[PDB]
Design a binder for this molecule. Structure first.
Ligand SMILES: *[C@@H]1O[C@H](CO)[C@@H](O)[C@H](O)[C@H]1NC(C)=O
Length: 361
């Protein structure tokens, strides 16, 4: 099985124990670590942070200890606007320029591949994404002739049915990609004025937003669209999402006034790192959504949907049962990478739980 793990370049800047550099990553934890994100500038791949050449080197130094570890560099993300990808992918010349720039940059920096994280392709982009993936793979095939093991090509793909339908030709891009990481953790609509879970494995009993807004639906639908199971990797979050409650109510359908207050370390309303949730749980009441198979917790006016060791184990057992290629974790810097917040003196408790289940049989 593959265990694909993202590291984000901006996590370095978090205050105190929040700060995460790539030497905090256990070299044997994941099969693949993806550094996120690269820029695109003058239609060529490029660095983003001031110190990315340094941190790329710190990541790639992990392979001294684990020579089998593979690294990838992800291009795009939400700070890069989808419109920027669109402009590059939609024209033969800019697409070629970009694609030609990729292998030398990856080689120089010690990466084993490229991950595409276009968030997200529209209706007008679908055919261009197909061309970009096909043509980038073709360039990786040519570059391999100069003697070094062929670069890997992956993509991070929406897990929302409407987004999938609008933007991706899954049957075609699956042929050329080495794996597809399914973003099975953005299932609570931005529009909703109630609490809910963003990463449920199955639908809830009572007005799920769709029958579609759950990991099981997403996996099934990618298989049905022609993604072979051995190309599909299911995403599992190490962060949770938070809400400010509008009333004393906390169970299904509880109204909310907006996102939850930011975490001390991650400083972003509506999201909390797992290590922050560990701490939040002190004094919190914990609940599970029985049919969705994922937990939430509440205290004061704050309500948090999250994933725990149990839930991520459960998701790993599911994905093996569906004979998928493995798991993807977003993100190492949001798991308890220091080991010191979650009461177990164990680094990477979520990601490690996933690993441990992938090895079972
Ligand atoms: C990213 O590339 C754009 C396109 O050139 C550029 O304007 C911007 O300075 C670059 N962003 C960063 C964070 O380097």
């Amino acid at each position: 099985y593959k265990l694909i793990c993202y590291y984000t370049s901006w996590s370095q800047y978090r205050e105190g124990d929040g700060s995460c550099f790539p030497d905090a990553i256990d070299p044997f934890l994941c099969t693949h670590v993806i550094y996120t994100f690269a820029n695109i500038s003058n239609n060529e791949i490029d660095t983003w942070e001031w110190n990315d050449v340094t941190l790329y080197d710190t990541l790639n130094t992990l392979k001294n200890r684990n020579p089998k570890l593979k690294t990838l560099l992800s291009v795009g993300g939400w700070n890069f606007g989808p419109e920027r990808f669109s402009k590059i992918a939609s024209k033969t010349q800019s697409r070629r320029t970009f694609i030609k720039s990729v292998p030398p940059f990856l080689r120089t920096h010690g990466f084993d591949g490229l991950d595409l994280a276009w968030l997200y392709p529209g209706r007008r982009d679908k055919r261009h994404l197909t061309t970009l993936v096909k043509e980038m793979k073709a360039e990786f095939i040519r570059e391999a002739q100069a003697g070094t093991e062929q670069l890997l090509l992956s993509a991070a793909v929406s897990a929302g049915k409407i987004a999938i339908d609008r933007g991706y030709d899954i049957a075609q891009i699956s042929r050329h990609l080495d794996f597809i990481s399914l973003l099975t953790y953005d299932f609570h609509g931005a529009w909703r004025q109630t609490v809910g879970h963003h990463s449920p494995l199955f639908r809830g009993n009572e007005d799920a937003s769709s029958r579609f807004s759950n990991a099981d639906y997403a996996v099934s639908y990618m298989l049905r669209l022609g993604a072979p199971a051995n190309k599909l990797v299911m995403g599992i979050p190490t962060f949770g999402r938070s809400f400010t409650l509008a009333s004393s109510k906390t169970d299904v359908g509880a109204p909310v006034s907006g996102p939850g207050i930011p975490g001390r370390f991650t400083k972003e309303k509506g999201i909390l790192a797992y290590y922050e949730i560990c701490d939040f749980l002190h004094g919190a009441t914990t609940h599970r959504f029985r049919d969705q198979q994922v937990p939430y917790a509440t205290k004061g006016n704050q309500w948090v949907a999250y994933d725990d060791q149990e839930s991520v184990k459960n998701k790993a057992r599911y994905l093996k049962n569906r004979q998928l290629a493995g798991a993807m974790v977003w993100a190492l810097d949001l798991d308890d990478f220091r080991g010191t917040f979650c009461g177990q003196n164990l680094t990477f408790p979520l990601t490690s739980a996933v690993k441990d289940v992938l090895a079972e049989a």
